[PDB]
Symmetry: D2
Subunit: 488 residues, 4 copies
């Protein structure tokens, strides 16, 4: 068990004045990992006032001075990769084989990426006439808030804080109450790297209280939220009701994976496995509707069954463990309800479908990797995001049909196609209504690549150059050197 975790405001840990606390559990064992202080409404005001003061210092530094500080944080993150991954595994239940290879690596990658782009953030100049011209500034928004999710805690904290800080802002970050521990470590790392006090403050708390106080605060200029659709709608309402904030949202999806008729089915099965069962299915971009040609459906089902048998649940710190428990018992209950709806609605259970039992599993919220086939577009498991290890296999006959069915959804996050054919790959992908599209692969999210959802799967984007710009606001300045003429 760890020492009680405090708030991080203005370069130091500090006690909350709310008087309230909460606990974070190890989902593998059910044991209390740490007691955590919850930030109250006055704590948020203190953090904002800290952030405002830090932001002015940060923005007044040179671009390269900011770049050097963020790269020092990158170097610290590279050195502590394994220790941070272990803490992440304890807090989330994700296997160390994942956390040590993805979470901090790809979080630091994005921070490293934006650190180098700070000097390239430029405005524009526009000649109007000999006697007048316009120039623009890309100015910081000021103080922004990020609200994190629990499936990739430190990666989300880095993907939100890196462009915000690179753009000259201070960020107040509220991690998920399920997974607050790595965000506090990151705040320490930033200060050790030289980040001015107040530029990155962390306020653990519950969404109903700490999250709401951030969305309502009048001096916060932007909210960036990753999480479930329900928590997103409230954030948008209290953010609409309160001061007019720019909001960015990354929500879930029901992303289609389209297997072409010319595709190698070993590759298709491998992609489908990686698109559904990584992080035990708790990934917004997962390809949970797998469309397979009728002529290859039976063979593909066998290949999935063979691969599902290879999934190795067990000690989360063991090298060969590649499957973990779900993050909490309530989350598993929702996944189990979807599985039962699949059975009742006439889907064919190909494997899995039950909790795991026995020594090492009875204390965690384990669900067996689950695959449904003979699925139809009207089934609940096909239409709604489950956020668990549940693959739906759907049959199709022709390309126009599968494009129509892949797009027939309010979700819009990701999509993919498996095919060796040049024309088929680009032709199909160009017609899919999704922001993130993979050809003959799944899941890779380079720092250079803007990612985000179409339709109901999000607002705005993360990563890429455009996200650095989206954490600035444009000021247009006209210099009139001619004599001004009034008609009055």
């Amino acid at each position: 068990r760890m020492a009680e975790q405090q708030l991080y405001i203005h370069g130091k840990f500090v006690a909350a004045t709310s008087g309230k606390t909460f606990e974070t559990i190890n989902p593998a064992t059910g044991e209390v990992l740490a007691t955590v202080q919850a930030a109250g409404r006055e704590d948020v005001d203190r953090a904002v006032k800290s952030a405002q003061q830090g932001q002015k210092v940060w923005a007044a530094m040179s671009a390269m001075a900011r770049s050097r500080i963020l790269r020092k944080a990158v170097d610290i993150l590279r050195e502590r990769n394994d220790e941070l991954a272990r803490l992440e595994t304890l807090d989330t239940g994700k296997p160390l084989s994942e956390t040590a290879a993805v979470d901090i690596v790809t979080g630091a990658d994005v921070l490293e990426y934006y650190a180098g782009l700070i000097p390239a953030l430029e405005g524009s100049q526009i000649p109007l006439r000999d006697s007048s011209f316009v120039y623009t500034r890309r100015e910081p928004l000021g103080v922004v808030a990020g609200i994190g999710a629990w499936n990739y805690p430190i990666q989300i904290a880095l993907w939100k804080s890196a462009p915000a800080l690179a753009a000259g802002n201070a960020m107040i970050f509220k991690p998920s109450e399920v997974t607050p521990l790595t965000a506090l470590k990151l705040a320490e790392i930033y200060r050790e790297a030289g980040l001015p006090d107040g530029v990155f403050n962390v306020l653990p708390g519950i969404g109903a209280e700490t999250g709401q106080y951030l969305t309502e605060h009048p001096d916060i200029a932007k909210i960036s939220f990753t999480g479930g659709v329900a928590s997103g709608k409230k954030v948008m309402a209290n953010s609409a009701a309160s001061s007019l904030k720019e909001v960015t949202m990354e929500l879930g999806g029901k992303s289609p994976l389209i297997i072409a008729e010319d595709a190698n089915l070993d590759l298709a099965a491998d992609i489908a496995m990686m698109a559904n069962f990584y992080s035990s299915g708790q990934v917004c971009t997962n390809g949970t509707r797998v469309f397979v040609p009728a002529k290859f459906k039976a063979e593909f089902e066998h290949k999935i069954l063979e691969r599902v048998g290879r999934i190795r649940a067990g000690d989360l710190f063991a090298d060969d463990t590649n499957f973990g428990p779900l993050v909490s018992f309530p989350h598993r209950q929702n996944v189990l309800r979807y599985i039962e709806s699949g059975k009742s609605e006439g889907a064919r259970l190909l494997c899995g479908g039950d909790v795991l039992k026995g020594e090492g599993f009875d204390n965690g919220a384990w669900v067996a990797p689950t695959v449904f086939t003979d699925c139809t577009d009207d089934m609940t498991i096909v239409r709604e995001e489950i956020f668990g290890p549940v693959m739906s296999i759907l049959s199709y006959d022709d390309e126009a049909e599968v494009i129509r069915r892949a797009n027939a959804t309010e979700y819009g996050l990701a999509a993919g196609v498996v095919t060796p054919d040049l024309n088929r790959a680009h032709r199909i992908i160009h017609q899919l209504e999704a922001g993130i599209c993979w050809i003959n692969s799944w899941g890779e999210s380079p720092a250079e690549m803007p990612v985000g959802g179409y339709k109901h799967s999000g607002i705005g984007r993360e990563n890429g150059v455009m996200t650095l710009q989206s954490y600035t606001q444009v000021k247009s300045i006209q210099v009139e050197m001619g004599p001004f003429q009034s008609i009055f």
Copy 2:
């Protein structure tokens, strides 16, 4: 009085199925200009289905084919400028000297600007490694909705529809119920130019009903709103509770005009006049807080008095008329209540402060050009947007003070400084919290120049290259040519 005006859906006028109608008044005479049908919830669904069909045709065309069609619309607008300006004057009360020289000219300027940029709308390509690369597409959002305000009806309709159409979308536009007529004329012009049926539909109606049905519709991907702060929060709230849509908002302001001690007071008075009394002060960007050095206040007040004396109210179609009535009689009542609040809080009335009377004025929603001086930051007339011909003059002593007071507001739309000093002009402008900044001028809004508000004055921008891109959504596509590795 005109024949009952209908909805415009899919290239033709069509009767509303709501059974509801409303009226628009000539604010110069009190007469009913026309009865206008109101779009019901089923009419909105019809418009969306029409827009979905038209958008597919429009996006399938070549970039230059879309450019040629929009440039044809520009040519029609130039030819019909005078006819359109007269209808705008009848509907808004703005003098023909304004509508014939600004409203359509600058609206058509923006459409002409975007028509030429369509072929330069490009994605990106990013090499990851020899065996994989990413490319992006800037895809249409699909169907978007624009909600217009009443002060610049046809200019707003063009500033919203031009980037939306240039980016490959269809727009459903809801004009303000106070001024619905010119938007319906615009729809016929677009069709005459060759715009495919459905790409620009106009649905007159009320904000509470028609506006809400648009903000609620699940198949509209973006809302662009121009209006008051109050209605904007509802739009964002209703849009939040409903389908998760991209939002752009251009709201009001309380923009400061900072007269420096080295300013020519004749130039400063001319700028102050144009920033307050054009369009009878019904302009979101107006510089309604005029900061003048104490040492110059009395002389500046005299120069202002001279310019108010030159204002020529009268028949809106006369060439010499440069001041009109307010857009409606209810709006005049709101402006009068602000004027009474100024007297009751002790602001000194320098001129105006009453309705205009006599033949040709007693029937119009006229307010005299009004100037309050000896104004203080806590007064209601200084804190709240009036949207009428009411200038507030505030004394200041030093630069740091005027920057703090200029910035001490929830509004953030525009700002300006009058000074011949190089350092003072840029130094002040860089510290002001506003998106639109004029040095030694006011009011010019080139098509190339992004415009929009800080803080509560808006979300996003209009005009400039960035606004064309903001009407597309980014799709990132990874081509993996190497062997895919599954960990399962």
Copy 3:
């Protein structure tokens, strides 16, 4: 017989003062099309003085004013497409089936493209610190010179003049002595569209005199040259010895077409035909080294021979004529010299290889469509650009080999691959050392697509947004608002 053609300087035709003239021949008949005056040194000086005056007027106009004038020129070009194409056919010998569908259509496409981009030509702004910032202007170079080639006379004149004029420069254009007529017509069209006098001047003449005088003139800021390698070096030499001009060159190539082992051979044959025999083989981008897998070569040869037999030479104004004579009789002698070296070096003649004879051909500079096979990389017809209708078919065994051989050349203009395989298409293309690469096609050159040569095939690029910027020069301006500190 046409009237004697004069120089076009400052908006009017004017007599040369050289005392020298030349004749242009109709290559289908041998007859003199027209006598054309040649510009001497004083004529070039006169053109520069005219250009300097006109450039100032042109650049002082608004961006949109320039845009509208160029679009008016586009409209005239569309209206006169057939008339201009017939003149081009008379001067060049290319079939009307080409000239009326390509030459002016794609020339006007580029002018239309750049006309719309003028308002998006923008500088940048870079904040250094609170007290200092930088902004940049993209200023016109001034007077630039274009030197055209004879194979696409009016297209080259448009591709060079469109970005130069759109960037605010004046251009002096020197057409090839072989094909001077359409350039003089283009000058008349620009004037009729409203181009200020002097902004586009045309000086027919010979390269050794008129061309050299332009490349040597101290007041020309940039040279753009399309032509053969030998003439380019002369241009580059005279430009270096003289005032320090920026040079751009589009020279020839020996571009490879790589047919993959999985390619459909009918598609491969159609692409190879279009890559070799359009415009009678007189195209810099032609795919004159056709690489075919050994196991498919015999079948590919059969398909080529069946298509070559469909080629229809004849009256250049007949709808079904798709093959024309070469541009001149001296050029035919060079092509015949290359054909004889192919025979003498042991390449196997598969078809053609001789002049065409009989009624209608005896007076034209006709060469039969010629195909060699069993070619090796050391043969002269494989190593050197012929600029005639001569295809070389080379066999290969594996992908690494064909890439090495495709790249083993000093030329670098174009390349292509025929394959339905996604990985193969991108993987091969990424390794080819050429600026213009076509997958499963040949020859399309969209206005948006930058085109130019690697290695010895060119310097710089044409088309695309980057070419508009390359006709401006950057001025960086630092505004220092802080106190300057001297160490002395």
Copy 4:
């Protein structure tokens, strides 16, 4: 010790059998003997660079970024050591070399290191069945030819964008100042730069430079130097393989002092624009245009400033003026100074060599100011590249603009004025690529710099220079049926 060539990550003996010497301009003594690269050495460097470039280009963008940033960290740590070597070779005071030469060199390397991941191509849809995408590909092997006034800074300003874009660079330093370029090559290797990616070939421009410009496998030349040498480079590159050339040449930059200017500010700007690095700077504002109504006051003010100049031991902290780069160069500066007298200019100060203990053995020229200067004097029309300020009087704004512009040079320019309109209005009409308002000499990594007209071709620094070390490849994917007309 006999300095050698640097090829493929090690020092190697030249195969020319030729050598040259570099002199310490403060003492006249030989600093070092340096081997000169011959034609076989150039072919060696190119062949090594071709092999190294593929390894370098095959790495990830961030892998290249990290290596270049490691070089930055080494340069910072070795700033003082490198600065001292620069002082010995160039004669610039340590107060300059330790504060500018490596600092601003590393700044550009650091800047470009961060931009590598943002180097992107484009994608253009043509129709549903076809689209285009572009790659920004390395040119391959490029060559840089450096000047002697800022040896290591030029090496960094040329090599940083070239390497960041994925190329290998062969750098030929000036024979006057070859030493710091060889240290940089060592630093790059220590940082992990693949062997061959940065090769250094000291030599003479008549030989070594020509062999680079003539080599058929070099895709681009970037040259900084004098106009005459540049024209020879461009000729030899013309006669040879078709290379993209970039040139940063000299200038006769005008410094325009307005009627509302503070003359204390103007005099400080004029001092830094003329006498930094002993006036051997291409961007120096050697023509100082001053209003007649103020000339006398500005002159007094110039004499006051010139009096604080502290020549002396180049390693002393308070020294701010050094000798010229070579005694032969000193003669040319003195030849121009004598022409001002012969042409009638009034000598306000300087104009001779410096004498006495510590100066008789150095290549010192006194800080020189002429006034009563006219637009026709040689010293006003031609670049001297020494500590010689020319003061010129003017009467109206149009005159000073036309006179400022009445030159074939186009490198830099400046205006001193507190008035908003005058600064922008004047600067927008001046024909120069580098314009300073109320300052002089600052050259941020973000800011493109280069000459109008005869003062240069192309630009250095800024994002645009990273792109200019790439070449665009356009790729059309045609997914529709291809139609032949035959």
